[PDB]
Amino acid sequence: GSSGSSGTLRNYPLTCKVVYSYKASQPDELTIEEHEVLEVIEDGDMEDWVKARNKVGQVGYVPEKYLQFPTSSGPSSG
Secondary structure, eight states, X not given: OXXXXXXXXXXXXXXXXXXXXXXXXXXXXXXXXXXEEEEEEEOOSSSSEEEEEOTTOOEXXXXXXXXXXXXXXXXXXX
16 A cells, blocks of 8 residues: 555554564565564454564565554553
């Protein structure tokens, strides 16, 4: 999407931190590696998979389960 859309859901975009490395085996996926924070612009075609763009600019589908979203919980009251 060239200067077309940005995100109307999940308060996108959403910056995530790749905590678990994942070698892309498909041309539709995105090669990610630990210590690599990306920017989720879309929830991808699938639900479990999301669309993110790495520093290189490559955009592919990646597993959110491994993605470290900002929306955290934290410790208990006090």
